[PDB]
Symmetry: D2
Subunit: 115 residues, 4 copies
């Protein structure tokens, strides 16, 4: 599992469950090609998006569907989603954890990169 996404809810103080996540990879044509997608678990975590083989060098965009999350909770948020865009594996394979903390008018994200 070279790519994991973890999402917490800053209003409730809990994992953000059932959050849709889409990952895209920039193609030769400079367009965003679909790469992988999933939904966070009861722990707010999304594993198994990809494999070491598939997760090649490239520029990736992780889109976390925060709007759908807030609206399912009956709340009208500010952002359409939270986006994390980064070059990956440029110096060899790494394991990436993309963590995001959500509030209706704000989000914060950080990356943990390990060898």
């Amino acid at each position: 599992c070279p790519l994991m996404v973890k999402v917490l809810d800053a209003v409730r103080g809990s994992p953000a469950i059932n959050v849709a996540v889409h990952v895209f990879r920039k193609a030769a044509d400079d367009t965003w090609e679909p790469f992988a997608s999933g939904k966070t678990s009861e722990s707010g975590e999304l594993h198994g998006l990809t494999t070491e083989e598939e997760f090649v060098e490239g520029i990736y965009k992780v889109e976390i569907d925060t709007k759908s999350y807030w609206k399912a909770l009956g709340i009208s948020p500010f952002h359409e989603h939270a986006e994390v865009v980064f070059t990956a594996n440029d110096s060899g394979p790494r394991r990436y954890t993309i963590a995001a903390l959500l509030s209706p008018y704000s989000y914060s994200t950080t990356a943990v990169v390990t060898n």
Copy 2:
């Protein structure tokens, strides 16, 4: 000024100066059209992006070029840029401030919407 962007640097404890910022508006074909742009001032602020007349309801993307900012500082960054995507909605008089706090491997953004 219905739209303002403010960027701070969490490493140096200072405004993030001379940071490039691009704003796009979503078009009917779902593509992103350039809408406005600029560079943050010595106070980390970017004013004068647009006018009330131009800033109609719609979906907007604010891209903050954090990678270049960190590069100019000799610091190794994670993200290509920071992205803030939101719908602008006409609910009485509203000024939008997009604030972003930058670290090499993390960013945090909030919106302040006031009358």
Copy 3:
């Protein structure tokens, strides 16, 4: 004004207004002595806390009464308050801005130190 505090609300997307803020300075017996206090304005800002003459080097604690703020809004909070503890150091001319972003179960704070 060598010391300014600014507080924003991540739930409502607005300045955090009328928030009580207490500043203490560490005394020789390691106790915290009241130093300055106030309430944030309609812009979420608290100015006029101290003067250059009074604001000498030392260790300071800024306590932001977030619990009361959330209570006044009918929202259930986690923290008793938000605390920012720092040493003030005379390195040329310096203004300190303590910024805090509030959510019910989270807070984020940064310092901006400018000349």
Copy 4:
């Protein structure tokens, strides 16, 4: 393990390892009594601070020694430490995760509370 502390480094994109953490509990006299302490592991996590029996109702302060962390890395940070102050177990025993993300001039903290 009703109390866990997790600390990440926003400059390096990694767990913050070997960070000292002290927990205090407010006593009848309104003073801060030492409650527990430890250091984060290679994963940035601190488990085993306390037990369900010892972790009674009360107001707790978790002090994360961010200054010592940054200085050990040869960096001069702004904060003396990061403090998280909260009432715990007021409606029965809960499990608390206190997460903190560190930059030299900024920190962000959130709580996950589960039943």
